[PDB]
Motif scaffolding. Sequence first.
Motif, PDB file in Angstrom:
ATOM      1  N   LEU A 102       0.893  -1.069   0.126  1.00  0.00           N
ATOM      2  CA  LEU A 102       0.007  -0.031   0.151  1.00  0.00           C
ATOM      3  C   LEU A 102       0.817   1.060   0.008  1.00  0.00           C
ATOM      4  N   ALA A 103       1.965   1.153   0.817  1.00  0.00           N
ATOM      5  CA  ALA A 103       2.768   2.581   1.005  1.00  0.00           C
ATOM      6  C   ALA A 103       3.286   2.875  -0.480  1.00  0.00           C
ATOM      7  N   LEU A 104       3.867   1.857  -1.312  1.00  0.00           N
ATOM      8  CA  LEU A 104       4.302   2.207  -2.679  1.00  0.00           C
ATOM      9  C   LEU A 104       3.318   2.830  -3.659  1.00  0.00           C
ATOM     10  N   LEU A 105       2.037   2.384  -3.308  1.00  0.00           N
ATOM     11  CA  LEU A 105       0.834   2.999  -4.096  1.00  0.00           C
ATOM     12  C   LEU A 105       0.834   4.443  -3.807  1.00  0.00           C
ATOM     13  N   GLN A 106       0.671   4.972  -2.486  1.00  0.00           N
ATOM     14  CA  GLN A 106       0.588   5.962  -1.914  1.00  0.00           C
ATOM     15  C   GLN A 106       1.959   7.063  -2.509  1.00  0.00           C
ATOM     16  N   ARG A 107       3.034   6.561  -2.445  1.00  0.00           N
ATOM     17  CA  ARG A 107       4.049   7.352  -3.191  1.00  0.00           C
ATOM     18  C   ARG A 107       3.754   7.353  -4.809  1.00  0.00           C
ATOM     19  N   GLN A 108       3.420   6.459  -5.108  1.00  0.00           N
ATOM     20  CA  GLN A 108       3.014   6.478  -6.872  1.00  0.00           C
ATOM     21  C   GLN A 108       1.957   7.393  -7.050  1.00  0.00           C
ATOM     22  N   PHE A 109       0.861   7.220  -6.298  1.00  0.00           N
ATOM     23  CA  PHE A 109       0.031   8.321  -6.395  1.00  0.00           C
ATOM     24  C   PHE A 109       0.232   9.838  -5.717  1.00  0.00           C
ATOM     25  N   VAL A 111      -0.316  10.847  -2.659  1.00  0.00           N
ATOM     26  CA  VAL A 111      -1.797  11.111  -2.108  1.00  0.00           C
ATOM     27  C   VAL A 111      -1.549  11.008  -0.378  1.00  0.00           C
ATOM     28  N   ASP A 112      -2.249  12.197   0.297  1.00  0.00           N
ATOM     29  CA  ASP A 112      -2.217  12.043   1.546  1.00  0.00           C
ATOM     30  C   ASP A 112      -2.924  11.032   2.225  1.00  0.00           C
ATOM     31  N   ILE A 113      -4.023  10.381   1.527  1.00  0.00           N
ATOM     32  CA  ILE A 113      -5.034   9.465   2.247  1.00  0.00           C
ATOM     33  C   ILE A 113      -5.085   8.410   1.191  1.00  0.00           C
ATOM     34  N   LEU A 114      -4.849   7.050   1.411  1.00  0.00           N
ATOM     35  CA  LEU A 114      -5.067   6.054   0.633  1.00  0.00           C
ATOM     36  C   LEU A 114      -6.337   5.184   0.870  1.00  0.00           C
ATOM     37  N   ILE A 115      -7.453   5.064   0.210  1.00  0.00           N
ATOM     38  CA  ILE A 115      -8.347   4.268   0.434  1.00  0.00           C
ATOM     39  C   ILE A 115      -8.395   2.922  -0.440  1.00  0.00           C
ATOM     40  N   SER A 116      -8.565   1.845   0.026  1.00  0.00           N
ATOM     41  CA  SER A 116      -8.535   0.716  -0.562  1.00  0.00           C
ATOM     42  C   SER A 116      -9.668  -0.242  -0.054  1.00  0.00           C
ATOM     43  N   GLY A 117     -10.149  -1.483  -0.612  1.00  0.00           N
ATOM     44  CA  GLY A 117     -11.095  -2.434   0.026  1.00  0.00           C
ATOM     45  C   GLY A 117     -10.551  -3.891  -0.092  1.00  0.00           C
ATOM     46  N   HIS A 118     -11.308  -4.584  -0.636  1.00  0.00           N
ATOM     47  CA  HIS A 118     -11.056  -6.149  -0.813  1.00  0.00           C
ATOM     48  C   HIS A 118     -10.798  -7.292   0.019  1.00  0.00           C
ATOM     49  N   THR A 119     -10.680  -6.617   1.464  1.00  0.00           N
ATOM     50  CA  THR A 119     -10.199  -7.687   2.520  1.00  0.00           C
ATOM     51  C   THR A 119     -11.600  -7.716   3.223  1.00  0.00           C
ATOM     52  N   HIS A 120     -12.595  -6.784   3.238  1.00  0.00           N
ATOM     53  CA  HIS A 120     -13.709  -6.849   3.916  1.00  0.00           C
ATOM     54  C   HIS A 120     -13.663  -6.692   5.529  1.00  0.00           C
ATOM     55  N   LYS A 121     -12.464  -5.965   5.909  1.00  0.00           N
ATOM     56  CA  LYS A 121     -11.674  -5.951   7.052  1.00  0.00           C
ATOM     57  C   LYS A 121     -11.395  -4.222   7.291  1.00  0.00           C
ATOM     58  N   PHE A 122     -12.353  -3.574   8.307  1.00  0.00           N
ATOM     59  CA  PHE A 122     -12.173  -2.336   8.467  1.00  0.00           C
ATOM     60  C   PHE A 122     -10.729  -2.125   9.013  1.00  0.00           C
ATOM     61  N   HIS A 127       0.699   6.017   9.059  1.00  0.00           N
ATOM     62  CA  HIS A 127       1.867   5.434   9.045  1.00  0.00           C
ATOM     63  C   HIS A 127       2.685   6.473   7.950  1.00  0.00           C
ATOM     64  N   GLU A 128       3.881   6.989   8.521  1.00  0.00           N
ATOM     65  CA  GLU A 128       4.819   7.789   7.885  1.00  0.00           C
ATOM     66  C   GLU A 128       4.119   8.827   7.452  1.00  0.00           C
ATOM     67  N   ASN A 129       3.568   9.812   8.279  1.00  0.00           N
ATOM     68  CA  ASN A 129       2.853  10.860   7.608  1.00  0.00           C
ATOM     69  C   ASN A 129       1.594  10.589   7.003  1.00  0.00           C
ATOM     70  N   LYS A 130       1.292   9.461   6.361  1.00  0.00           N
ATOM     71  CA  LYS A 130       0.112   9.256   5.587  1.00  0.00           C
ATOM     72  C   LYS A 130      -0.863   8.267   6.086  1.00  0.00           C
ATOM     73  N   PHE A 131      -2.241   8.747   5.603  1.00  0.00           N
ATOM     74  CA  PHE A 131      -3.296   7.893   6.433  1.00  0.00           C
ATOM     75  C   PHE A 131      -4.054   7.033   5.229  1.00  0.00           C
ATOM     76  N   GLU A 181      -8.695  10.550  14.399  1.00  0.00           N
ATOM     77  CA  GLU A 181      -8.165  11.788  13.748  1.00  0.00           C
ATOM     78  C   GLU A 181      -7.109  11.896  13.023  1.00  0.00           C
ATOM     79  N   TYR A 182      -6.894  12.524  11.860  1.00  0.00           N
ATOM     80  CA  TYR A 182      -5.697  12.629  11.160  1.00  0.00           C
ATOM     81  C   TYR A 182      -5.376  13.903  10.532  1.00  0.00           C
ATOM     82  N   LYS A 183      -4.275  14.499  11.005  1.00  0.00           N
ATOM     83  CA  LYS A 183      -3.714  15.928  10.372  1.00  0.00           C
ATOM     84  C   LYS A 183      -2.493  15.793   9.427  1.00  0.00           C
TER      85      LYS A 183
END
Lengths: 184, 4
Positions: A102-109, A111-122, A127-131, A181-183
């Motif tokens: 997930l972190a590589l995609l964050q850097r690739q995009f 983005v400040d926040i990365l939303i993903s699904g597929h696991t059905h687990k909230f 993590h390292e400044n990102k949400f 909360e995230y800042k």
Amino acid sequence: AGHRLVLVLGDLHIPHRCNSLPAKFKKLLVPGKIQHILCTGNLCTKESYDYLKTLAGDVHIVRGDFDENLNYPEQKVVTVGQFKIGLIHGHQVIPWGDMASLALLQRQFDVDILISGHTHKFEAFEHENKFYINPGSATGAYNALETNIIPSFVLMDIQASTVVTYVYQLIGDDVKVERIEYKK
Amino acid sequence: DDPL
């Protein structure tokens, strides 16, 4: 007031695995309150897309591995307020839900926040400044790993430099709400 | 509160 309310949900799997959202989620999801919807995919038909449209005018959906609509993009980057947000269903993240992947995609995009699904687990963690947010499955639909899926969805309250993420979970037959909360 |  100056807040932007974003509904984050996905993996409904209507009508193959479930017929409807839990009754107690539908009472809370009323029209005219949510500004934007970010959906991780697997609706899986137009009936659920239409349902999301009754909640907000601005619906954003990425393509899940069981979606009938092949026009949905694989991934999407949007900006809400001061936050760049990435969205992807998550069946492309190998192994599933791995934060290194997930972190590589964050850097690739970028983005400040990365939303993903597929696991059905909230999950929602910083993590390292990102949400990172996974809203789980809003219907509690069974999974290809299952083990007791809890229906859930997420509401982001975005105002200035802060995101207040609210998690709604159906536990027993009661809606439990948690707040993170995230800042930037 | 919560928004719902």
